[PDB]
Design a protein around this motif. Structure first.
Motif, PDB file in Angstrom:
ATOM      1  N   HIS A 204     -11.246  -2.353   1.138  1.00  0.00           N
ATOM      2  CA  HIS A 204     -11.516  -1.006   1.341  1.00  0.00           C
ATOM      3  C   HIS A 204     -12.128  -0.200   0.095  1.00  0.00           C
ATOM      4  O   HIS A 204     -11.795  -0.270  -0.915  1.00  0.00           O
TER       5      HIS A 204
ATOM      6  N   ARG B 100     -14.258   0.403   5.192  1.00  0.00           N
ATOM      7  CA  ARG B 100     -13.577  -0.785   5.039  1.00  0.00           C
ATOM      8  C   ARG B 100     -14.717  -1.859   5.707  1.00  0.00           C
ATOM      9  O   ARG B 100     -15.303  -1.423   6.303  1.00  0.00           O
TER      10      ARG B 100
ATOM     11  N   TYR C 119       6.050   0.334   1.846  1.00  0.00           N
ATOM     12  CA  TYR C 119       5.079   0.135   2.964  1.00  0.00           C
ATOM     13  C   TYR C 119       6.027   0.550   4.200  1.00  0.00           C
ATOM     14  O   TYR C 119       7.313  -0.084   4.166  1.00  0.00           O
TER      15      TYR C 119
ATOM     16  N   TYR D  18       0.043  -3.398   6.314  1.00  0.00           N
ATOM     17  CA  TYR D  18      -1.571  -2.816   6.022  1.00  0.00           C
ATOM     18  C   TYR D  18      -1.528  -1.767   4.978  1.00  0.00           C
ATOM     19  O   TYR D  18      -2.198  -0.742   4.927  1.00  0.00           O
TER      20      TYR D  18
ATOM     21  N   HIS E 238      -1.269   4.933   7.712  1.00  0.00           N
ATOM     22  CA  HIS E 238      -2.193   3.657   7.805  1.00  0.00           C
ATOM     23  C   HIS E 238      -2.091   3.189   9.544  1.00  0.00           C
ATOM     24  O   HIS E 238      -2.287   2.124   9.689  1.00  0.00           O
TER      25      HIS E 238
ATOM     26  N   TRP F 108      -5.798  -4.758   1.874  1.00  0.00           N
ATOM     27  CA  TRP F 108      -4.703  -4.561   2.660  1.00  0.00           C
ATOM     28  C   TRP F 108      -4.252  -6.112   2.814  1.00  0.00           C
ATOM     29  O   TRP F 108      -4.861  -6.908   3.315  1.00  0.00           O
TER      30      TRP F 108
ATOM     31  N   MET G  11      -2.043  -0.731   0.806  1.00  0.00           N
ATOM     32  CA  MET G  11      -2.934  -1.059   0.081  1.00  0.00           C
ATOM     33  C   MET G  11      -2.249  -1.426  -1.350  1.00  0.00           C
ATOM     34  O   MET G  11      -1.991  -0.718  -2.228  1.00  0.00           O
TER      35      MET G  11
ATOM     36  N   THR H 134      -8.724 -11.280   4.405  1.00  0.00           N
ATOM     37  CA  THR H 134      -8.227  -9.685   4.084  1.00  0.00           C
ATOM     38  C   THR H 134      -9.199  -8.648   4.406  1.00  0.00           C
ATOM     39  O   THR H 134     -10.228  -9.193   4.834  1.00  0.00           O
TER      40      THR H 134
END
Lengths: 214, 223
Positions: free
Chosen positions: B35, B50, A49, B105, A91, B99, B107, B32
């Protein structure tokens, strides 16, 4: 909609190889790119991430880089269990968009197809149809050319192939061509032949049988 | 642990309506975002919508905006996606996911997905057909046999061999959409030619859509 362009589209790399996948952000997306693994027929898994940090429980042979608007996932020493499709994702804005995926298939020593032909069962043949099947078992590379001769005259579009995902133990693919035709045309011809071309074969193997119901 | 399940997918007729659901355990969806990501057959991952369960705010993908409604009910810890005027383009596997927010953020947890097929086509189950050995040549060493699963709708079918006991050298291929709009598949198995006659090979074919369960005993012939 910022577009994540992702290259290559797939790669044969060998066990122990360093592998590098890039995803180029079409707009600066800052540092907000995550990378995912998709093992066939399964939910996506997070690996990295916000560009760089591994998820907890992701093996350190995986790693992510940022250099402007180009993002890199690196597998130091590709393991045989990293047969998967990797996805990248900005994202940063909404929508979260994804890259088109990179399939990473393991390379190994060019094996050769064991070819097998199968006549139509007559429970099918009763139903007015005939599916003649050709099997090409445990070969590598994936590429190969099956070629239907029916009394030597090979056919146009009436055959359809399907292929295995590569195996987990021995990295081979398998594949089948299914020539299907009406019980009428089927019975016009006598000899039904399949002609397999591959690198693992010096000569094209031809599997065949004479028309059934005998 | 953080688990996310999905349900209620299946065949819808076009223009119909469906309600997929997503039952979150291990966490409170309250704090949270949830999505809904989809994936058509043999293509990439498309985001659809979302929800922030807490102030209920939503955001949609244009393909979907107006026809689909994502909602969440925090007392049931479940989130839902309401699909209306379903086009064939909506045939995909649907995954909800979350997320974490705390740190990312990304997934991190995803569900297993649920197949939604949008078609005009009525459920039909498999005719199961033997693919038998020694059709010209009897001798060889290793013989091959299979079952040909033909003309079923929708996906999936599940092929097993001898009630799950013959797992070796079993190759069930990807299904193929026929010109006919119906599927076909082969499941094959390699075995010794010594055993043909000493052993029965039987494939088990479960089309859970039509509630079909065929067992075919694949045994040899001469010509």
């Amino acid at each position: 909609d910022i577009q994540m362009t992702q290259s290559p589209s797939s790669l044969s790399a060998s066990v122990g190889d360093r592998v590098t996948i890039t995803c180029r952000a079409s707009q600066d997306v800052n540092t907000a790119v995550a990378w995912y693994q998709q093992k066939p027929g399964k939910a996506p898994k997070l690996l990295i991430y916000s560009a760089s940090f591994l998820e907890s429980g992701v093996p350190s042979r995986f790693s992510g880089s940022r250099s402007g608007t180009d993002f890199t996932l690196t597998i130091s020493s590709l393991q045989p269990e990293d047969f998967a499709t990797y996805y990248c994702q900005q994202h940063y804005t909404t929508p979260p968009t994804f890259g088109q995926g990179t399939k990473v298939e393991i390379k190994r020593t060019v094996a050769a197809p064991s070819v097998f032909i199968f006549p139509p069962s007559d429970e099918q043949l009763k139903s007015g149809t005939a599916s003649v099947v050709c099997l090409l078992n445990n070969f590598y590379p994936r590429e190969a050319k099956v070629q239907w001769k029916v009394d030597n005259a090979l056919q146009s579009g009436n055959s359809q192939e399907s292929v295995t995902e590569q195996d987990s133990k021995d990295s081979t693919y398998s594949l089948s061509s299914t020539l299907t035709l009406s019980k009428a045309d089927y019975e016009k011809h006598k000899v039904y032949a399949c002609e397999v071309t591959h690198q693992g074969l010096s000569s094209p193997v031809t599997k065949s049988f004479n028309r059934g119901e005998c | 642990e953080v688990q996310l399940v999905e349900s209620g997918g299946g065949l819808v007729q076009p223009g119909g309506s469906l309600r997929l659901s997503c039952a979150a355990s291990g966490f409170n969806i309250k704090d949270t975002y949830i999505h809904w990501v989809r994936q058509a057959p043999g293509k990439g991952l498309e985001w659809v919508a979302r929800i922030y369960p807490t102030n209920g705010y939503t955001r949609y993908a244009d393909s979907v905006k107006g026809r689909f409604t994502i909602s969440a009910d925090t007392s049931k810890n479940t989130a839902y996606l309401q699909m209306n005027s379903l086009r064939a383009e909506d045939t995909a596997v649907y995954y909800c996911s979350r997320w974490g927010g705390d740190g990312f953020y990304a997934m991190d947890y995803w569900g297993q997905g649920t197949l939604v097929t949008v078609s005009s086509a009525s459920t039909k189950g498999p005719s199961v057909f033997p693919l038998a050995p020694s059709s010209k040549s009897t001798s060889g060493g290793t013989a091959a046999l299979g079952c040909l699963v033909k003309d079923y709708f929708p996906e999936p079918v599940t092929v097993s061999w001898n009630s799950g006991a013959l797992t070796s050298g079993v190759h069930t291929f990807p299904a193929v959409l026929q010109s006919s709009g119906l599927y076909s598949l082969s499941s094959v198995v390699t075995v010794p030619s010594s055993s043909l006659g000493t052993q029965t090979y039987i494939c088990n074919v479960n089309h859970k859509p039509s509630n079909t369960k065929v067992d075919k005993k694949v045994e040899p012939k001469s010509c």
